[PDB]
Ligand binder design. Structure first.
Ligand SMILES: CC(=O)N[C@H]1[C@H]([C@H](O)[C@H](O)CO)O[C@@](O)(C(=O)O)C[C@@H]1O
Ligand SMILES: CC(=O)N[C@H]1[C@H]([C@H](O)[C@H](O)CO)O[C@@](O)(C(=O)O)C[C@@H]1O
Ligand SMILES: CC(=O)N[C@H]1[C@H]([C@H](O)[C@H](O)CO)O[C@@](O)(C(=O)O)C[C@@H]1O
Ligand SMILES: CC(=O)N[C@H]1[C@H]([C@H](O)[C@H](O)CO)O[C@@](O)(C(=O)O)C[C@@H]1O
Ligand SMILES: CC(=O)N[C@H]1[C@H]([C@H](O)[C@H](O)CO)O[C@@](O)(C(=O)O)C[C@@H]1O
Ligand SMILES: CC(=O)N[C@H]1[C@H]([C@H](O)[C@H](O)CO)O[C@@](O)(C(=O)O)C[C@@H]1O
Ligand SMILES: CC(=O)N[C@H]1[C@H]([C@H](O)[C@H](O)CO)O[C@@](O)(C(=O)O)C[C@@H]1O
Ligand SMILES: CC(=O)N[C@H]1[C@H]([C@H](O)[C@H](O)CO)O[C@@](O)(C(=O)O)C[C@@H]1O
Ligand SMILES: CC(=O)N[C@@H]1[C@@H](O)[C@H](O)[C@@H](CO)O[C@H]1O
Ligand SMILES: CC(=O)N[C@@H]1[C@@H](O)[C@H](O)[C@@H](CO)O[C@H]1O
Ligand SMILES: CC(=O)N[C@@H]1[C@@H](O)[C@H](O)[C@@H](CO)O[C@H]1O
Ligand SMILES: CC(=O)N[C@@H]1[C@@H](O)[C@H](O)[C@@H](CO)O[C@H]1O
Ligand SMILES: CC(=O)N[C@@H]1[C@@H](O)[C@H](O)[C@@H](CO)O[C@H]1O
Ligand SMILES: CC(=O)N[C@@H]1[C@@H](O)[C@H](O)[C@@H](CO)O[C@H]1O
Ligand SMILES: CC(=O)N[C@@H]1[C@@H](O)[C@H](O)[C@@H](CO)O[C@H]1O
Ligand SMILES: CC(=O)N[C@@H]1[C@@H](O)[C@H](O)[C@@H](CO)O[C@H]1O
Ligand SMILES: CC(=O)N[C@@H]1[C@@H](O)[C@H](O)[C@@H](CO)O[C@H]1O
Ligand SMILES: CC(=O)N[C@@H]1[C@@H](O)[C@H](O)[C@@H](CO)O[C@H]1O
Ligand SMILES: CC(=O)N[C@@H]1[C@@H](O)[C@H](O)[C@@H](CO)O[C@H]1O
Ligand SMILES: CC(=O)N[C@@H]1[C@@H](O)[C@H](O)[C@@H](CO)O[C@H]1O
Ligand SMILES: OC[C@H]1O[C@@H](O)[C@@H](O)[C@@H](O)[C@@H]1O
Ligand SMILES: OC[C@H]1O[C@@H](O)[C@@H](O)[C@@H](O)[C@@H]1O
Ligand SMILES: OC[C@H]1O[C@@H](O)[C@@H](O)[C@@H](O)[C@@H]1O
Ligand SMILES: OC[C@H]1O[C@@H](O)[C@@H](O)[C@@H](O)[C@@H]1O
Ligand SMILES: OC[C@H]1O[C@@H](O)[C@@H](O)[C@@H](O)[C@@H]1O
Ligand SMILES: OC[C@H]1O[C@@H](O)[C@@H](O)[C@@H](O)[C@@H]1O
Ligand SMILES: OC[C@H]1O[C@@H](O)[C@@H](O)[C@@H](O)[C@@H]1O
Ligand SMILES: OC[C@H]1O[C@@H](O)[C@@H](O)[C@@H](O)[C@@H]1O
Ligand SMILES: OC[C@H]1O[C@@H](O)[C@@H](O)[C@@H](O)[C@@H]1O
Ligand SMILES: OC[C@H]1O[C@@H](O)[C@@H](O)[C@@H](O)[C@@H]1O
Ligand SMILES: OC[C@H]1O[C@@H](O)[C@@H](O)[C@@H](O)[C@@H]1O
Ligand SMILES: OC[C@H]1O[C@@H](O)[C@@H](O)[C@@H](O)[C@@H]1O
Ligand SMILES: [Ca+2]
Ligand SMILES: [Ca+2]
Ligand SMILES: [Ca+2]
Ligand SMILES: [Ca+2]
Lengths: 388, 388, 388, 388
């Protein structure tokens, strides 16, 4: 009933514990599970849920053929109970479209879906499950947003959008929403040169987003937002522990204010928690494909251009498929600190497994522990041969 | 807890944004989706839902054979969560029958289903999910009603019924319900010559219904209802932009008080928003079949017999199947005006696609934006060949 | 929150309107619908539901083979939303067993299931969805009860049980429950000679049950219960309009205090509303099998041994299968009178349709109207050939 | 809203009445039922539910192949409505892992799941459906817990864990949780020599757990816990009525403080109610396999090393498969005493039925009656041949 404020710091991250896993592809082999991609997790004050972009067809359905494609009229933001699969029967549609974000402000939820042709897309902003505001494309080139949850502070929920080229300069804007209405927007500033798919979290009245530089950067750009002043800055993770994909091999020195070069015109959505010595980065294990997943403790990664790992945890083996990854937290949990969480999208099917005509995924997520817990690896678990 | 009153005017309609889409036929290829037709959308104070007439069988079911037929003992008004498909497992039965309307009065919902043989049908009026009033056929020839939501003002919810010929004069009545009980009824008056399937909306204490003249009219008849005085008038859309189907080509001058001739004994359910310069008409793109769908801004369409379009938006391409269309609004949304919405029924199967033995549909709906948003088209999306 | 009292009389029954229909066999041809039999309907203060005895298998399932049998360890009382089918996914288990009754007292629901071998059955009485009281077989021969709803007055809910022979004298008891606990029980008294499967309703502080005399009677026995005094009487419907099945042809004079002879050791569950001139009897149309269903207005049927029909309504054609029938009312509806309702079980499969190895049913129900409504017939609607 | 206290004694157990049965394997032959094992039952103040460890696949699914294995990344604690089957669509995930316990403290529920590799497992303790505490393996050898409900008193919920060898001494700890946080833990004390899979219940401020001595004991070890002092003792059931499996034949004298020998390195989860003369033991009927199930009244079983049965009830015939068994009660029921309940896991498939490639189960549960009720037997009911 009151707006949530980001009054807590991050809990100390000494390891990662299992939080949720839906095993959707394994289950959907013989049940009515929707084809998805671009998943995430997001909490309300009373419940945490899985989110994704449906493809408007089940995996066993004949319409799963062609679901490698990102943008169609048959996609929607859906949510469903934590660690359940996204089924026809339990999935709740938040809005229609092929790019999305969602977050709860303490009173109710804002959800945003973008749809349309590449040269004529529009965002619709829903609040309390009703449409409130619409925003037309400004650069006529795939208006797109975070693909993971936004974050609110005292009713203000900033959102990062990009419109324009994926392979060159583009037009990124930060919109400050309150009750679904635009209070303010700003063009991107600071030293980040290209922004896509920001993964955001909040602590002590500041919002930190780790994004994707698709054009040039194999280091990740970072936007930090003041939701009270409604202003921001941007830079890159200084660390030579490079966290995009594909990427070149790790150097000994990163770049703070420019893209680390070697790979152009590609990338993957990812995240980090940047908190002094309590800093952890996620990356694919493979430098070449969306394969494996690990967390690395890299003290002062944001500001130290020579920072290297001091601790890690494997999440997905390099012999298993990963995908997108992003940040969320339960802002309504008990205790004195916010417990960092993340999910990894485990992509199955095309293009890496082309004996099937579909592309989908399942989800695994973890939250931080102050213990030093033993590690397991967490693969999707399905046998593609079963679908043949 | 208090009855809703129609105290707001329409918001300015500068374009249409995507509101919901269930992709039911695509999904139902490989999941337990009910065969439907005659869908619509209707809001409660806390939730908006999809509605339709079930055929009492799934699409993949063997009993889907013969579902081209309109009236059987196996039909029911069902509702289900917005943008979900109507499945066996999530569909809520409102009442039994093969013609329906439904609306929430601010306190609770009235639903009306008609059933019976052609010469002996009866309406049952449910209120708060209990049967309250029954009305026997008066002309012994397919008692039938709106096939989209009714509208209430201070507890009074008028409903348009017709009984008698589809190809000649018939007996249309306006019933004024309150808490499921008949306060009053009137025979149709004014200059409309035949009435079927009224699509209604409310603003500033007046209810406007755009209907179907099946007998002679390719322009659409309009009934306007005063729910306080419980009186009405009727006429036609004066505009030469003709909105029934099938229809002749558009002339340069319409008819205000008579059917525009050229096509007899056929039609399709449709709608309009008639609000001075803020007037938008829906129509099929094709003059010959239920094919394509567009919105056209036609200032003063109701009263100006030479009014032509000043703006439009394609909703469904002429190379895709459409169907019935109708009006609803979220009367319980925030803000200072009512946002116009509509749905289009996207019919698949018979008679146009006769390699399958069924007829069903999916739903797409839009609401108005005060922005000038880019357009997409929104087809059903299923491949009939998959069902062979 | 207070116990319901039976303070109203019956509404005037001038005809019957459609109330609910699940089309379960049609739907279950291609969806996960449970095999059932012995269905009924029962209301809570906020909701009316369908009830039946599951067979613990779907209709398309291989375990549907053998479901002609009445009593197994795999049966349960289930309930589900009105006019939905009883599916694996929406069916709520009330208790385990192969004979049941259920009713809401205004505060919460009592449900009773009997299970066990023929010579060692026991009833368990649940109240507020917890087990409270148990009753062991007293005659060691299929302890059994109503197979339709019980009725409560000020917290007292009487229930009719029988234990002993189906083809000879047996031991019938009336148990008076309050909050799941036995206040009192009585052995059957009056002139009814054999009692099974009582269909009960309540009005003006009196409960009337129309039952099945399996041993000798083709007229139906009637128990009338005073739930305040906790006493009862019994007799037969005096009317020569005979309402059991199988039965001989109607005579011109019935029997008030003895079984009307001609058919031994068989019958079907049925019901009536006995209310002076406002008296309506249900029966199968066929005298030989569970085929067709009609309602007949038979003024003073209970007390007039020459009473004949003055009005009727066909519910199911004689060319369609029927089955069990029973009474319920919405005791929590608005208005000044209780509206009589009933359901008919539409049995499909064995023994009448033996090309399938299963037996199941769907449900149709009607409530009374004070109008003289036109009639339709309401068959199950499934094609058995589809299941071959 | 207040913590529950164990203020009542056990009701007198004169027999066992049927409480719930899901028939999951029968149903899942033709519906989307999850593969499970290690089930139990547990009540909240408003609802009792079935619980089990999913295998993250349906039974008909191709991924059911290999589900004989106990520990994978695809397992989760799920719960679902009482006597329903665990389906994809109705199952709620409590946490991720391959060993679990769960209990409600009167205010909210604690659930515990352990996951990880054998040498590096960890428990996560959820409370109010959020992760609160984590515990790393202490002996690096399959950290594991009860596989049935825990019990709380004034907010304190003790839990028994074991880590280390299954075939030798191991390290068992009793953790005392309150609101998901560790108040205290103790190493196992008393004369029990090996502890696994404790089945617990509470009465008069004391918690009694009957466990599994896998290493040496065919009598069952017992831990009794004081949740106020947070202290415990342990011993064995003195009775010569031996209740583990496999086991040697019953002797005439048991052992109170040592394992009864004859069978090493194997066992099954089981339970008892130890209450002076009101003492009942469950066991498999077979001494060799998980076959049959009976309850035996064995006065003073705990303390009398010559105690023999005075009464019994067969639950599952020796010609039917059983499995794990455990205790729960509805601590929130009305009345003056706690009614003892239990479930039996009915395992189907491997290793005993190896013509199928899966292993799963269904559930049956009973609660005590103060009547002397007739008995039935309660098999799983599925035909394995149907799955071939
Ligand atoms: C809105 C949209 O189409 N987003 C798509 C993006 C963009 O193509 C890139 O961010 C380049 O801008 O990336 C994906 O293709 C990918 O890499 O898996 C998936 C995603 O659906
Ligand atoms: C999941 C999986 O099998 N990953 C393998 C990948 C992929 O096969 C290709 O990168 C895709 O083209 O290749 C590796 O050489 C790599 O990139 O580190 C090794 C890894 O074992
Ligand atoms: C009650 C009823 O049968 N309504 C049917 C109507 C009427 O036939 C026409 O309005 C003529 O009166 O139109 C349809 O056939 C149609 O055109 O798709 C469908 C609809 O189910
Ligand atoms: C969805 C679709 O394919 N529509 C086509 C229709 C139909 O084929 C017929 O009208 C049905 O008989 O025909 C058109 O000539 C028309 O009417 O404008 C062109 C349009 O492309
Ligand atoms: C408890 C029980 O077995 N009830 C069964 C009864 C009894 O056999 C009769 O009432 C004779 O007592 O009738 C049926 O067989 C029937 O006629 O369709 C179905 C029902 O399940
Ligand atoms: C549903 C149905 O087909 N009913 C028919 C029944 C059954 O075939 C047999 O009674 C069953 O053995 O037979 C009749 O002669 C009858 O009894 O009145 C006519 C009726 O048309
Ligand atoms: C955590 C774990 O693996 N538990 C497994 C246990 C242990 O192996 C034994 O208790 C020996 O410690 O027993 C089972 O194998 C069994 O006997 O059916 C099933 C269960 O899943
Ligand atoms: C369910 C079942 O069939 N149980 C039978 C079992 C099993 O076949 C084997 O014990 C498994 O190997 O064997 C018995 O000799 C036994 O142990 O008492 C008899 C019993 O009838
Ligand atoms: C949950 C909560 O305390 N929210 C507070 C809100 O009450 C307050 O109005 C706002 C500005 O002070 O900061 C935030
Ligand atoms: C708490 C701890 O020791 N964690 C270490 C981790 O830092 C290391 O990356 C991994 C592989 O060696 O083994 C583990
Ligand atoms: C024997 C083994 O694998 N031990 C691993 C250790 O390497 C790792 O550091 C730790 C925390 O991640 O989990 C454990
Ligand atoms: C929601 C609301 O304000 N409804 C009002 C109602 O309270 C009032 O009684 C009626 C007549 O004045 O008009 C309407
Ligand atoms: C805001 C706007 O310009 N909308 C126009 C619309 O009026 C026109 O019908 C369509 C096709 O030309 O292109 C667009
Ligand atoms: C390049 C292109 O297609 N632009 C379209 C324009 O024609 C249309 O007017 C507008 C609003 O509908 O959407 C955009
Ligand atoms: C809903 C209702 O009015 N129930 C009344 C109850 O309050 C009263 O205690 C009882 C005896 O007088 O009769 C009944
Ligand atoms: C209101 C009315 O007239 N109902 C009659 C009914 O009594 C009769 O049984 C049936 C068949 O003739 O036709 C109708
Ligand atoms: C033409 C026709 O069938 N009319 C029937 C009439 O026979 C029946 O009496 C009435 C009420 O049931 O329904 C109507
Ligand atoms: C439901 C209930 O009565 N719980 C009581 C709680 O109120 C009390 O605080 C505690 C210690 O006295 O014992 C328990
Ligand atoms: C109440 C009663 O007599 N129960 C007995 C039970 O003790 C015995 O084990 C069983 C088999 O003889 O038969 C029964
Ligand atoms: C004839 C028969 O089987 N009677 C059984 C009896 O043996 C058993 O003692 C009792 C209670 O379990 O149930 C009954
Ligand atoms: O694979 C994770 C890291 O391992 C090592 C190097 O090959 C790095 O370039 C790489 O990113
Ligand atoms: O050097 C940083 C870390 O690298 C790795 C391990 O050898 C750790 O013990 C060490 O602290
Ligand atoms: O000790 C630090 C080491 O921890 C482990 C892995 O995460 C290594 O990548 C890392 O260097
Ligand atoms: O197709 C929409 C309109 O286009 C043009 C003319 O052919 C009209 O008669 C038609 O209605
Ligand atoms: O003429 C009315 C409208 O017709 C079309 C377009 O050319 C619009 O710019 C114009 O305003
Ligand atoms: O500018 C008006 C024009 O807009 C566009 C289309 O909707 C045309 O039908 C219309 O004439
Ligand atoms: O069929 C209903 C009635 O019709 C006539 C006679 O054959 C009766 O005996 C019969 O019961
Ligand atoms: O005779 C009783 C009734 O029987 C039949 C009809 O002919 C009715 O009109 C008549 O009233
Ligand atoms: O008019 C009374 C008549 O009504 C009609 C049928 O129900 C007949 O059975 C009945 O005799
Ligand atoms: O089968 C139950 C009991 O029956 C007898 C003996 O064979 C015992 O050893 C056994 O445990
Ligand atoms: O001996 C204990 C019990 O054993 C068995 C039966 O014979 C019971 O009657 C007896 O009481
Ligand atoms: O009378 C006691 C007897 O009851 C019966 C069975 O449970 C026997 O095992 C037991 O000895
Ligand atoms: Ca990049
Ligand atoms: Ca027309
Ligand atoms: Ca009889
Ligand atoms: Ca053992």
């Amino acid at each position: 009933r009151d707006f949530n404020n980001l009054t807590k710091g991050l809990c100390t991250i000494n390891s990662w514990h299992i939080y949720g896993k839906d095993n959707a592809v394994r289950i959907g082999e013989d049940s009515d599970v929707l084809v998805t991609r671009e998943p995430y997790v997001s909490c309300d004050p009373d419940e945490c849920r899985f989110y994704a972009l449906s493809q408007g067809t089940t995996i066993r359905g004949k319409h799963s053929n062609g679901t490698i494609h990102d943008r169609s009229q048959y996609r929607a933001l859906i949510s469903w109970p934590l660690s359940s699969p996204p089924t026809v029967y339990n999935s709740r549609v938040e809005c229609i479209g092929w790019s999305s974000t969602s977050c709860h402000d303490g009173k109710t939820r804002m959800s945003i879906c973008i749809s349309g042709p590449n040269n004529n897309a529009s965002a619709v902003i829903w609040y309390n499950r009703r449409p409130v505001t619409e925003i037309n494309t400004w650069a006529r080139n795939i208006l797109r947003t975070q693909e993971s949850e936004c974050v609110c502070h005292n009713g203000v929920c900033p959102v990062v959008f990009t419109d324009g080229s994926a392979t060159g300069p583009a037009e990124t804007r930060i919109y400050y929403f309150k009750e679904g209405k635009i209070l303010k927007w700003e063009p991107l500033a600071g030293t980040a040169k290209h922004i896509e798919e920001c993964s955001c979290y909040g602590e002590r009245a500041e919002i930190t987003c780790t994004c994707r530089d698709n054009w040039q950067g194999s280091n990740r750009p970072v936007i930090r937002i003041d939701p009270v002043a409604m202003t921001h800055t941007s830079q890159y993770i200084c660390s030579p522990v490079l966290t995009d994909n594909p990427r070149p091999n790790d150097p000994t020195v990163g770049k703070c204010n420019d893209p680390y070069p070697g790979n152009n015109n590609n990338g993957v959505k990812g995240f980090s928690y940047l908190d002094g010595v309590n800093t952890w980065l996620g990356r694919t294990i493979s430098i070449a494909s969306r394969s494996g997943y690990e967390m690395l403790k890299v003290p002062n990664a944001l500001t130290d251009d020579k920072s290297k790992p001091t601790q890690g945890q494997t999440i997905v083996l390099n012999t298993d498929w990963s995908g997108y990854s992003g940040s969320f937290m339960d802002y309504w949990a008990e205790g004195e600190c916010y417990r960092a969480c993340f999910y990894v999208e485990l992509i199955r099917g095309r293009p890496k497994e082309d004996k099937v005509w579909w592309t989908s995924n399942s989800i695994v997520s973890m939250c931080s522990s102050t213990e030093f817990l033993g590690q397991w690896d967490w693969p999707d678990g399905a046998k593609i041969e079963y679908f043949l």
